[PDB]
Amino acid sequence: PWDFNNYYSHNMDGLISKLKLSKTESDKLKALRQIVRERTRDVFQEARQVAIDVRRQALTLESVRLKLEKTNVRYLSPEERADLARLIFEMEDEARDDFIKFQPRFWTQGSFQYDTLNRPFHPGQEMDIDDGTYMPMTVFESEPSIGHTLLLLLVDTSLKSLEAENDGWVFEEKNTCGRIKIYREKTHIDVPMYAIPKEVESDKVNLALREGVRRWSVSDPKIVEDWFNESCKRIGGHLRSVCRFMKAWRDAQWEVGGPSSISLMTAVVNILDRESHNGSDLTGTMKLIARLLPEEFNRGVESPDDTDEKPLFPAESNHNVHHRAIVETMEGLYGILLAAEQSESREEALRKINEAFGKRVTNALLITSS
Ligand SMILES: Nc1nc2c(ncn2[C@@H]2O[C@H](COP(=O)(O)OP(=O)(O)OP(=O)(O)O)C[C@H]2O)c(=O)[nH]1
Ligand SMILES: [Mg+2]
């Protein structure tokens, strides 16, 4: 049978090389992130100035709106400009004091932070940067002091101003963040908005929600970051590799949608924690993962953040048809890895395993007899 260890891990031409970004590419994403950060800083500063002038100069609501229409708030729709005008006009002294005193902070969460960001594969897919905006403020036991709509409209202001001023830059509203899509760079940047104490305890990291009936959700991304980094320590460095590969498999099977990265990561560490394996043997390890992955999602995948009320993926008895489509797709993986392994020719093995991870590795000479 064929060994795929070099298919997976060979420098420059192996799968990890096709997935992982170079320093040049990473620096590009950082530069793109910096553009969004600086603009959001500007927007917050512009808003803060008007927030100052409100109580300072006893402004009318109209005077507030007209000032905001000299800033980046210009690019919101009329109702949104009026709404932000009202919010800044009528924010309480305590909330106003916080807003004026503190600048927003920026910290990246997700795969760009714990190094699992893959290159995109299908034409529509994009590299994903999760850069959160954090506002220091009084955070009571019940909720943050500053209204969630205000902060969300300031994020929208930033991204919509970037959209309006740049071609290829398109704003998209998600449930948990504002997203700016940069077509020319095959990159989009997710901007979740957070409220945090100004005095960071994870029990006070509040995420501002954009859809539904709940305004805030206590969700510290640091918890997932800490959990995954500790998992890499516990299981071994090959965890990032096998997580990258599974995400690559997901990107190959789904142009859009499919199981989330977090659920994939959690399922993999659950397997690798439970089952004895050889980290150095990526061929066997990936085969182990593929075999057991559907049963993990059948068992249900609980969030590594215990504060979450719902699991990342329900138990089988709670699976809807969309869940089943995912699991049945997962069941297909193990068969692909074994057919490749038992392919009669070397070029046949490559084409077969590339049905799982997509045509990225093209060098059949990486495949060696076991
Ligand atoms: N608690 C919790 N946190 C989530 C969930 N989904 C995303 N997050 C937070 O958002 C961060 C980024 O999420 P994703 O963009 O979907 O995954 P990723 O790690 O960045 O991988 P990818 O390259 O595919 O973007 C990681 C995690 O802290 C979730 O369902 N529950
Ligand atoms: Mg991400």
Ligand SMILES: [Mg+2]
């Ligand atoms: Mg994202």
